[PDB]
């Protein structure tokens, strides 16, 4: 019969495979529009007719063969689909899927297409990535090689559409939890893949080592989208955990690496090029690269601040007012009582209508710029015990467990809690410092262990011997941490049986981490949380996670500056000649090193900012004066260096030459958490 006369529908399908047609949008668009209706009901009808099925015997609901299914999606790889044809071909395929006996055919055809297509790429990609950095700077590239990447009738767009539709089939509607992400991995795995991904790394790192008039590293934009589509749902979370050692070599073997260990190992060897694409087209964070947000480590500081700015709240309508008449001698309390509840939600929408006592409008408006600075200077208010100047050093302020004495400290925290956000709400650089532990209370992170050594040797010395050498249950040291409560020093049971349970070789980490947590978390932290409550109220926790505990300081205090000569001369060497000749090349590269690169380094050995003045010979820490002295320590000679801001101990395991020490120091400064922190 051929079904041509026994079913009207097949007539239309017979159109699809006619060269005379399918070279136009309207014809394809209109035919797809028509098919959108029958298939919509066709899927509904049979699926909706279980017991009262008296309609299939009337219309003869067709049966779908091999060529009944392949024909619908044979055009998704055609040279005519626009961004209207696809948006309906996808819906056609989805609606048709619900009919029995199709999903297997769909998947088999899709993987066949994938294997068919991902073989011309490598035959061509090798051609391109072998050209970059092979002629000169100032020359051009034979368009024919680029002619295969530029036209919308390329191959990449197909390699993106195919994966898009696979996801949509296994994504659209249904339940994400009900999904079966596991098998999704296999389908791409069944695809040959591999070489294409691995052969791409030799093209996305071939622009950082050359220059060209064409340059334009955006040509390989399509793929990179797909390479993120593959990882879009795999885990992209908790797989980043690595570090341990500094590799100091690329290699980039990407044969298979399954499809869940392809995300984080990739995107690291290529960080310079990736970063220098957002700063040229900042709109590339709401689409193609939208996923990178879940990899904070891979985004430098500058792009992060901008991406934070535009998204922040650019939807308001000016600020009505803020009639506050502080006399400039009370400030803090006058505002704590005058701002009462100035539309907390829209409290941001209030300009500072403040004059010192009788002054006028000069040097433009917003002269309160200094008002905040003096506020910060007056925020500490040494008379009040709301904080402590970090007994370890006056340069910073401390949670000050004795902050509960102040009768009305509660409302005060919210004021400064939201006021600090106001400076963040604007572009200000008020000076403030609270040391790493205080910052970590904001960003979701547990307390650190090594901080005790430098933050407060007192209790670390109580455990300095313990955790090594003498940690053999020789001492008892019943569990639970010493408790100060302005009275009876009753050691409060950390665990349910802290007093009864001893800190044996088994109860090591729990007791140690909770004792450390008690100092930094069981303190006025609850009262200081009031400072966070307003800050959290003003800005959501998710809105700040893009940064880390280390860079929140730089957000608060303007990017600090630093010279070279003072740090070059005001130095000290212990069993060392200031270097092995390796720090020397880094000593020169410090000028090459970015201010952020330099600035972060100071935080590693001090963690306070606030350039000490006097030429770095003024190193007032715990002893009032210090001089950071490099130490050899006869460590592993390849392990990452270390230091202690208590006295700027500093360290340098003997390295060899360029690359090794350079990147080791780079990682150390970028290490932040999991190094001198939690670890």
From Swiss-Prot:
The active site is at 646 (glycyl thioester intermediate). It is found in: Nucleus, Nucleolus. It comes from the Eukaryota. Residues 343-679 form the HECT domain. Disulfide bonds: none annotated. Present with 350 molecules/cell in log phase SD medium. Probable ubiquitin ligase protein involved in many cellular processes, such as transcription regulation, maintenance of nuclear structure, cell cycle, mRNA export and rRNA maturation. E3 ubiquitin ligase proteins mediate ubiquitination and subsequent proteasomal degradation of target proteins. Involved in transcription regulation by interacting, and probably mediating, ubiquitination of some subunit of the SAGA complex. Required for SPT7 ubiquitination. Participates in mRNA export from the nucleus by regulating the transport of hnRNP proteins. Belongs to the UPL family. TOM1/PTR1 subfamily. Interacts with the ADA3/NGG1 subunit of the SAGA complex. Interacts with KRR1. This is E3 ubiquitin-protein ligase TOM1. It comes from Saccharomyces cerevisiae (strain ATCC 204508 / S288c) (Baker's yeast). The gene is TOM1. The chain holds residues 2590 to 3268 of 3268 of the full protein.
């Amino acid at each position: 019969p051929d079904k041509k006369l026994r079913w009207p529908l097949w007539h239309l399908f017979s159109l699809l495979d006619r060269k005379l047609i399918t070279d136009e949008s309207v014809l394809m668009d209109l035919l797809t529009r028509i098919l959108q209706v029958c298939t919509k009901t066709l899927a509904v009808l049979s699926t909706s007719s279980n017991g009262k099925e008296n309609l299939s015997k009337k219309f003869h609901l067709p049966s779908f063969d091999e060529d009944d299914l392949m024909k619908i999606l044979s055009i998704i790889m055609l040279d005519s689909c626009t961004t209207r044809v696809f948006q309906q071909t996808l819906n056609i395929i989805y609606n048709l899927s619900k009919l029995q006996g199709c999903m297997s055919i769909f998947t088999k055809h899709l993987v066949s297409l994938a294997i068919s297509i991902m073989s011309k790429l490598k035959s061509a990609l090798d051609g391109l990535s072998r050209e970059v950095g092979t002629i000169t700077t100032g020359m051009e590239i034979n368009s024919e090689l680029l002619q295969k990447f530029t036209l919308p009738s390329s191959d990449q767009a197909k390699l993106l559409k195919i994966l898009t539709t696979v996801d949509f089939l296994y994504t659209h509607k249904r339940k994400e939890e009900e999904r079966n992400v596991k098998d999704l991995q296999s389908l791409y795995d069944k695809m040959n893949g591999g070489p294409v991904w691995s052969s791409l790394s030799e093209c996305l790192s071939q622009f950082e080592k050359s220059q060209a008039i064409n340059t334009s590293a955006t040509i390989l934009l399509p793929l990179i989208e797909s390479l993120m589509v593959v990882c879009r749902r795999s885990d992209l979370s908790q797989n980043r955990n690595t570090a341990v050692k500094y590799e100091d070599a690329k290699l980039l073997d990407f044969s298979k690496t399954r499809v869940e260990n392809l995300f984080f190992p990739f995107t690291d060897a290529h960080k310079k090029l990736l970063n220098q694409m957002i700063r040229s087209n900042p709109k590339l964070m709401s689409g193609p690269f939208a996923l990178l947000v879940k990899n904070p480590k891979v985004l430098d500081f500058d792009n992060k601040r901008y991406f934070f700015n535009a998204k922040l709240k650019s939807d308001n309508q000016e600020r009505p007012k803020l009639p506050i008449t502080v006399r400039r001698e009370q400030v803090f309390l006058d505002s704590y009582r005058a701002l009462f509840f100035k539309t907390n939600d829209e409290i941001k929408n209030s300009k500072l209508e403040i004059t010192f006592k009788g002054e006028s409008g000069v040097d433009a408006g917003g002269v309160t710029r200094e008002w905040y600075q003096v506020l910060s200077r007056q925020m500490f208010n040494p008379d009040y015990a709301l904080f402590l100047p970090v007994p370890s050093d006056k340069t910073t302020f401390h949670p000050n467990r004795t902050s509960g004495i102040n009768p009305e400290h509660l409302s005060f925290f919210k004021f400064i809690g939201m006021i600090i956000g106001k400076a963040i709400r604007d572009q200000c650089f008020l000076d403030c410092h609270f040391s790493r532990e205080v910052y970590k209370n904001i960003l979701g992170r547990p307390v650190s262990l090594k901080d005790m050594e430098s933050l407060d040797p007192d209790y670390y010395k109580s455990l300095v011997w313990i955790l090594e050498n003498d940690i053999t249950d020789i001492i008892e040291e019943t569990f639970s941490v010493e408790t100060d409560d302005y009275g009876e020093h009753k050691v409060i049971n950390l665990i349910e049986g802290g007093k009864d349970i001893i800190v044996t070789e088994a109860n090591k980490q729990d007791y140690v981490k909770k004792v450390v947590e008690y100092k930094l978390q069981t303190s006025v932290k609850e009262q200081m949380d009031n400072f966070l409550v307003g800050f959290y109220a003003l800005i959501s926790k998710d809105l700040i996670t893009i940064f880390d505990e280390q860079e929140l300081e730089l957000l608060i205090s303007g990017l600090p500056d630093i010279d070279v000569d003072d740090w070059k001369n005001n130095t000290t060497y212990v069993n060392y000649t200031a270097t092995c000749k390796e720090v020397s090349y880094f000593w020169r590269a410090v000028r090459s090193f970015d201010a952020e690169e330099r600035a972060k380094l100071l935080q590693f050995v001090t963690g306070t900012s606030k350039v000490p003045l006097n030429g770095f010979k003024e190193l007032s820490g715990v002893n009032g004066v210090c001089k950071f002295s490099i130490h050899r320590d006869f460590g592993s000679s390849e392990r990452l260096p270390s230091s202690h801001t208590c006295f700027n101990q500093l360290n340098l395991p003997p390295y060899e030459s360029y690359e090794t020490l350079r990147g080791s120091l780079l990682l150390a400064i970028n290490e932040g958490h999991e190094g001198f922190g939690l670890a």
